[model samples]
Target: MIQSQINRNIRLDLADAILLSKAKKDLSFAEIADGTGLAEAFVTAALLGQQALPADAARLVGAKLDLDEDSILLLQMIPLRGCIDDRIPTDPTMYRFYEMLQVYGTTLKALVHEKFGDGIISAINFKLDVKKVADPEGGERAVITLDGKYLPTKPF
Candidate 1:
């Protein structure tokens, strides 16, 4: 169960509450970042809902600020689809990657299932690679690669 002192009104989201609480204490973003041992950019992004706070960061921030588990869990919730607005992703190459994820996530899932025969990759074991590749058209293209091992459940 979540701690009462940490819980906020249902109307306020976790990010909003955290920002408000910090403001109420008159703490600067740098102060909060220093206290939490997180980068100011990360803290700012989290406050704006542009990035998700990892579990350890959530727990640390919660403990320092006396936030309840429920509030932390709310902050940890995986965002649903359509979180990014198209107008915001104006960059051509950056937007292309987002568009690829939107279109190909299901295709990748199907391929994984076909190869593994009813199994899923371990997110804990996943790896990511990002690099710039030369493009004949003009500017360099950004390439991102994700590699993971599949884990299957044992039959009962």
Candidate 2:
């Protein structure tokens, strides 16, 4: 049976095991996601302990990572889901996002509100994609897209 989480620790431990296995087996995230019928990012997020995978996906990844049943069950459990534990992120790459929020948080809010009118984007109904593209200035760049449904709030 699929279970809801009471804590992040168990899932975090599973993520560690997954990471160790990936490193030991020299497998890329794309490779791990292959044959699973899921996007690499979705499987990667599930492996990172932020989301739950369905039974088949869990089984596929379990086979790839050599995970035990208990670990596999943990992957199917609904996660407690916070990648950053309650403080500002310190990692430089992650911090860049925080910095972007600090700079454009309100701007995004205003723009979104202006365009959408008293609504919010639903992350639950979202799609994320990370594309690597060549920059015109002669370097590679990541183009991360967060697409979500626009949900209007109305109470009557």
Candidate 3:
């Protein structure tokens, strides 16, 4: 039977190796994720230990990274996700995201309740995407989409 990992050690180590191999190969996540029959974001998340890959995807990515059989097997195992070490993030990029939630989280919660009633968004049944577009003023803008199912609370 397939099993989930209780600890993050192996996944963390594999992430290191995957990053090194990606850099050595000069490959983008898009390139590594190509032909994996999965979303680039999803595949990339799996590589970074936030998700798990199927056997076929694991083998495909393993071949690209030249990973050993053990590493590939570990890839198929569920990851102990949520990489944040502290309650507050220090990294600027990650912190910006945390900040957004801090600022908008309540507003989002209010709106969701107003619109969807007493229900929570399901991250388990979700899709994420990031797109880059030229800004009307200058530089660029990132459009991040988080699509999740809205599950209503049931009387228990």
Candidate 4:
């Protein structure tokens, strides 16, 4: 399956509206994803304007969100990709990741280069997952995984 993450303007607005509808209906993304036979994240991104939903998935989400026919059609169209609005990323939670990178980006690069040797991990060939687990110290902890294929540099 071709999975892209872009938010083309027209459809983007529609998807944004859809999210509002979803909220008015008091729906969790999991609820919208249910019975659609699609992953919750996939459905959530599609609903949030980052990915395109296939026809069946679109109709299912449409019915669930009470989206109009045109809106449902828009959901099936391929997006331009890359949903992040800010170049620097201003959202607080989003900024935390940026801050982490600010603190560790070079460290990560150094480690990656030392460990992998002239290579980089590809988000194109990646999967992301978040898990909640019990922390030994106490409280819940988030185990975030960014699984990507390692691509090595080639010398011509």
Best by TM-score: 3
List runs of model 4 lying over 4 Å from the truth: 1-7
Number of the top lDDT candidate: 3
Assess candidate 3 and give its TM-score to the true structure. Answer: 0.96
Candidate 3: regions farther than 4 A off? none
Candidate 4 lDDT, 1-156, residue by residue in tens: 454425478767887798789889999988998988877767888887767788899999899888889888888877776667857788998788889889999998898889887889887787676689999999999887878788999999
Better of 1 and 3 by lDDT: 3
Better of 2 and 4 by lDDT: 2
| lDDT measured at residue 28 in model 1 versus the true structure, 0 to 100 | 69
lDDT of 4 at 128: 73
The ten-residue window of minimal lDDT in model 2 covers: 82-91
Candidate RMSDs in Å, in order, are: 8.0, 1.2, 1.0, 2.9
Clashing pairs in 3: none
The lowest-lDDT stretch of 10 consecutive residues in candidate 4 is 1-10
What lDDT tens digits, residue by residue, belong to model 2 across residues 7-96? 888888889888999999999999999998998999999999988999999999999999999988889999999877566998989889
TM-score of each: 0.40, 0.95, 0.96, 0.83
Q: lDDT tens string, model 3, 1-156? A: 277988887798899899999999998999989999999999999999889999999999999999999999999999989777677899998899999999999999999999998999888999999999999999999999999899998889
Query: Comparing candidate 1 with candidate 2, which one achieves the higher TM-score?
Result: 2
Q: lDDT for each of the candidates? A: 0.62, 0.90, 0.92, 0.82
Comparing candidate 3 with candidate 4, which one achieves the higher TM-score?
A: 3
